[PDB]
Ligand binder design. Structure first.
Ligand SMILES: Nc1ncnc2c1ncn2[C@@H]1O[C@H](COP(=O)(O)OP(=O)(O)O)[C@@H](O)[C@H]1O
Ligand SMILES: Nc1ncnc2c1ncn2[C@@H]1O[C@H](COP(=O)(O)OP(=O)(O)O)[C@@H](O)[C@H]1O
Ligand SMILES: Nc1ncnc2c1ncn2[C@@H]1O[C@H](COP(=O)(O)OP(=O)(O)O)[C@@H](O)[C@H]1O
Ligand SMILES: [Ca+2]
Ligand SMILES: [Ca+2]
Ligand SMILES: [Ca+2]
Ligand SMILES: [Ca+2]
Ligand SMILES: [K+]
Ligand SMILES: [K+]
Ligand SMILES: [K+]
Ligand SMILES: [Mg+2]
Ligand SMILES: [Mg+2]
Ligand SMILES: [Mg+2]
Lengths: 524, 524, 524
């Protein structure tokens, strides 16, 4: 098809306008004081939301050049949220800030490449500054505070996550579920999570999460060298009449006929998923039986002579809920007797101190953490079905952010961290003036989140920013209470990974737009 | 699809317009002097109504932003109606008033978050104030009055609800059914209601109200806990032959049993439902025999050596209609013989005289109230199928609003209650001027129903409002006779629940629109 | 879908326009001198008609608001003719006069509710004046005149009806069906009519009369409600194999039974129809037996231990024809033995001497009336197909108007009665000035029919109206002969009910339009 082709400022103005539409709609929702955005549906009542992610999903523009701008920022901002578990709105605000000033500098005739170079140097520096400024998240009070902030000021979610980690540890495995109702519930059941992905896509159920999920699955374990689908048929008939889904764990899955396992489940007849066994040699086999003892079943080894059609249903292990993934498999509520589990845990212990090299000492210590660790299950309570499912969503978001906070620590929220990092960079320079201006563009933009938060409050951004800047450290503005104080003392905490990622991704896409001379799209 | 995106004032003006169209159409129908609205239909003659529910249901606007505003207020007014059984028009009027004055303040530069805070603070105060002002609805004269108001102004439906309660008690069981015609008839049959619900949610044949409806079902009463589906078969077969659905009331239904029955129920092979028998020990036993006597069935007791397999079709009780929701089971028109039910009642009244414990005595009297209480069935009237089906949702709503009047009491009608409460709130203040303005916005809005009622009379609303304010308590304006008097004495009563539900729901949507900065919809 | 919403005077002009189109098209056909209306067909030559009903049927307007106005008046005017046997054109002419003046008064700023009250008050008074002005219709002469007038000066029709009543009595049961030959025929047969409608609308054979037609069918009589199809199987199979339709008369038909019968009737297969047994208690049982005695059939009761599966073809009664309306059911030519009927009549007449209640006396005498009275059948020959249906439809209208003449009496035709009544009300007043204007609106409207009748004659309405006014009593203008004289003497008679119903219905719809603030319809 023939193309519409724009260059230079003509192209760049278009991009900026589309970015301005996306950002202006997303950014009004920033903060505890964020405004509502009404999102139409083709039927019934409109959706009213303060959630920036929801607002961003909906944005598509008629003008194809403007729309290219909006989509570029959208993709980048969502990458951030996927990496750190939060910060979509903050990233979008940043992108708009850098993009606006950067383009201003381009139009003034400054070197675009130099502007991009300077923005990058500021960001590289800003990221280091954040690492230094960062502080560990350890005590459960701080952890609760992080969750609460990610749950949009809901002290219950943060209280739930902190309670979960208080059971299975901050590094422990945690899964969220729908409860019977009316109050949050917490139970630590038997189960484990190991790293394996599903061997082929299309296995995904509930595609929004992009992870496969089953309910009360049968579990199969083998060496997997085997042959292929044709031989293993006999076990497939028994399950079909249960009926129960099957999760096959094996050294790998090679077979094409084995790859015809994925297809027929697409037809909906029987729901199944296959996943590899982690590691090689005696290490993976010991872990195969590790899973067998947990799920109350025996592994099938073509070495020992055991054949897959020789394996009865009761012989195959079983669990309650299982969630596999691209990088991960998780077993919830394994039906294996606690006598088999604890009996083996003491054995893993025995091998520890007989083992000499510290590499065997560790990995082995990893398996004992899985069997003896279990899986924390958060059952979300509420008054209603729809009022519940929302909260299950907010708990899942707060969880990843808290995980983030555990890894890289926390910083002053409310955009205080970025504002402090900017002051620390005041003396930063590049190789020439253009790069210098690029650095200043990035530093000015670091003020955007706080100002937008303040703006959504109905307060003067210049006034709060000026007052905050006149203070030091963790001194900042609490937008909920309209008070200045110590942000950490007040419980307003961003995971450092989130703040970092938001800046990096925004600077990425901004660098590209600033460096764009040409756009090509179809004819309207 | 590409979207149309509007911000701030430009957006809010559109919302206000849509609200204005919706509310201006709906509010002319408020109160005894309400004007007619003609509603078109694709085929045949138009409909003419004073009922705001019918008018609002029909409103959809061409401009997509305007339409969003209207749908927003609509959703909120219908929720009010679903909660209190009435108040749709009042809710809509309050909504337009709060929104109108709030948006004025926003465009005058005031803080929307503070405006919303003031509104919320004022409504909260008003809700307590209403609860204090509330007075009990007990005597038959008052119930008929509340029914007539909820009618509206139909002494037939109003009276009819009174005998219904007068016969079965104000706490009694009253149900609305289609009826043959051409009048509405009230029948009292043998039936009761106890607290039990579907052991599985999958048994629901009516998703809207979320309940199980079995027509002319057989009823199985067994003491044993049901686990294996095998022992059920001899009875399950005989039930499939008869062509009637089955209801299972037992100690419990679990394991293979609960799993099996719900499996086939989803399929076409069976229509059935099961519930847990209420109570424990001898009471659970005594209650099962209660239900047995009502339905003409025999309790199957594994204690005596009675087995499920031996249980025949005659052993099952029968009823015309049974309704199982989440929290309760309702058995309508049991087949049991009066001589037996009367004897069963006589037996229990004996035990009451023999009762040493006040607790044991209260529990027994609850058993007779259910057995001797019966169930009130209202079969809806008129002629054609269009009104007849529509009328049923009316009387149901009227009955609901009447129950709510008995539970939460009554306040002066004709918008007088809101007027009074707004006077008690004259000294109420917020944190800042903008919250004060919000409080005043809400307090003026509370005058809107009475003013609108009067305006529909062709009378000056400011004179009537001012004259009512000058009086105290229940002094108000009777819009039927165009004369002042005592609202309670003149029989003009609102369920307190309706009034507060309308205020709360209206202030909800108003706060949302006042805090909306962005709207997203499809292209024109 | 999105709607077009109009308010106030803007809406009411549109409504007025559509009313003016309808009424101006229809009113030219009023009276003996009515003009021609040409009605186009999609092919060939146009259709020419003096029939006001045919003209109204065609009117649909492009502007949806205007069209709403026209359809509102058609529907109501159509109702007068359904409850009377005439008056549709009179009602339309009346509606337009009231609507026009009323709407003009509203636009002038007068209180619409007050105007409606004044109109209603005048109509109530006029209805009373009509009642006092009314005179009995007794002798065969006046009965024939009433039928003649409603048949459009056809003396054959009034003569035929009067012969029907001369046999079976003025309150007797009469039915008109297709004439076999060129000449009409009248036969009195044993049969009855009672009030039962079709339980479902979904079975009616002929769309124009909206009634069920069953030829030589079976009649089922059951003392129980039938909730299950399985009890009707043995009898239902017998009937389908006999090549005869089935009429079901029971305590009720509901559940799977009714839904199924609207299946195997509506869809195809054999024709069947069901009606409720009139009344309740023992009167329902007594009445069921009455039908059984008349139809030569046996009542099936659970009370004696009878069962429907045991019911053979011999237990069912039968007749030659059964016509089931919405309101009524008519059995024509019962198969029962006269010795059985006369013995049943005697037993009922015996219970009358034993009756201790005056209510019991009256209800017993209407059963002896149905049994002993029988039915008068009218078969009307036109000499050709198209003329027979047309004439037969005139006889059906005249018959209905004659019953109305019998019940409420007759008054002076040519719109003389309304003029006379309007001159008696000249001093009638109201609560205030607006009501007074409302009364005058009604009184002026009362002259519209006479004036239109004269205008259609081509004389001056003003002159003739004034001459009639200046006379007294039954003095009026004969529009056929163009001479004045006594309207009763000249044979021009309107059943009081027709004049009444015409005025009342016209004033009803006019009251609604005068009180309308809003109209909702589809986008253009
Ligand atoms: N009480 C508060 N005062 C100031 N800032 C707050 C407060 N609560 C939350 N925030 C800030 O709001 C930001 C997150 O807002 P949010 O609307 O969730 O956007 P994102 O999608 O970027 O997480 C964080 O920077 C957080 O510190
Ligand atoms: N005689 C009366 N005088 C004044 N107000 C009345 C009278 N009768 C009913 N009302 C009031 O009219 C309102 C109900 O109007 P309605 O059209 O039903 O609106 P809604 O849908 O909000 O119930 C109630 O507040 C009720 O008290
Ligand atoms: N010879 C007559 N002279 C004067 N008026 C007549 C004569 N015959 C019939 N009418 C009048 O014509 C009117 C009947 O109008 P018609 O054309 O049948 O419309 P509709 O019956 O639907 O009102 C009656 O008021 C009747 O009195
Ligand atoms: Ca739409
Ligand atoms: Ca249409
Ligand atoms: Ca043509
Ligand atoms: Ca009189
Ligand atoms: K937010
Ligand atoms: K109303
Ligand atoms: K005519
Ligand atoms: Mg967040
Ligand atoms: Mg109401
Ligand atoms: Mg006529």
């Amino acid at each position: 098809a023939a193309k519409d082709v724009k260059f230079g400022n003509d192209a760049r103005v278009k991009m900026l306008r589309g970015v301005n539409v996306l950002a202006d709609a997303v950014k009004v929702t920033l903060g505890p004081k964020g405004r509502n955005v009404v999102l139409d549906k083709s039927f019934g009542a409109p959706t009213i939301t303060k959630d920036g992610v929801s607002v961003a999903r909906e944005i598509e523009l008629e003008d194809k050049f403007e729309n290219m701008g909006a989509q570029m920022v959208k993709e980048v901002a969502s990458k951030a949220n996927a990496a750190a578990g939060d910060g979509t709105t903050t990233a979008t605000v940043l992108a708009q800030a850098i993009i606006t000033e950067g383009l201003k500098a381009v139009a003034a005739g400054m070197n675009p490449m130099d502007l991009k170079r300077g923005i990058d140097k500021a960001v590289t520096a800003a990221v280091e500054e954040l690492k230094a400024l960062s502080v560990p998240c350890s005590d459960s009070k701080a952890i609760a505070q992080v969750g609460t902030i990610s749950a949009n000021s809901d002290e219950t979610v943060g209280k739930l996550i902190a309670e979960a980690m208080d059971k299975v540890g901050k590094e422990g495995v945690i899964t969220v579920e729908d409860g019977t109702g009316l109050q949050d519930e917490l139970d630590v059941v038997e189960g484990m999570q190991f790293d394996a992905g599903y061997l082929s896509p299309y296995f995904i159920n509930k595609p929004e999460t992009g992870a496969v999920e089953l309910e009360s699955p049968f579990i199969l374990l083998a060496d997997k060298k085997i042959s292929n689908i044709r031989e293993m048929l006999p076990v497939l008939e028994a399950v079909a009449k249960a009926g129960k889904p099957l999760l096959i764990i094996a050294e790998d899955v090679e077979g094409e006929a084995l790859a015809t396992l994925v297809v027929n489940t697409m037809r909906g007849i029987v729901k199944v998923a296959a996943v590899k066994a982690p590691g090689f040699g005696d290490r993976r086999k010991a872990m195969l039986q590790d899973i067998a003892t947990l799920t109350g079943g025996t592994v099938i080894s073509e070495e020992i002579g055991m054949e897959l059609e020789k394996a009865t249903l009761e012989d195959l292990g079983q669990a309650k809920r299982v969630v596999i993934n691209k990088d991960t498999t998780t077993i919830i509520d394994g039906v294996g007797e606690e006598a088999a589990i604890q009996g083996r845990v003491a054995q893993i212990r025995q091998q520890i101190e007989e083992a000499t090299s510290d590499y065997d000492r560790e990995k082995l210590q990893e398996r004992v953490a899985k069997l003896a660790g279990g899986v924390a299950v958060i059952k979300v309570g509420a008054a209603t079905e729809v009022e519940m499912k929302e909260k299950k969503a907010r708990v899942e978001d707060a969880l990843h952010a808290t995980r983030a906070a555990v890894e890289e620590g926390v910083v002053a929220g409310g955009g205080v961290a970025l504002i402090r990092v900017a002051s620390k960079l005041a003396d930063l320079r590049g190789q020439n003036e253009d790069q210098n201006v690029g650095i200043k563009v990035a530093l000015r933009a670091m003020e955007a989140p706080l100002r937008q938060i303040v703006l959504n409050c109905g307060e003067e951004p210049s006034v709060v920013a000026n007052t905050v800047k006149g203070g030091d450290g963790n001194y900042g503005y609490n937008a909920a209470t309209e008070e200045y104080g110590n942000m950490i003392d007040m419980g307003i905490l961003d995971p450092t990974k989130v703040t970092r990622s938001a800046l990096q991704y925004a600077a990425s896409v901004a660098g590209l737009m600033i460096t764009t001379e040409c756009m090509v799209t179809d004819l309207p």
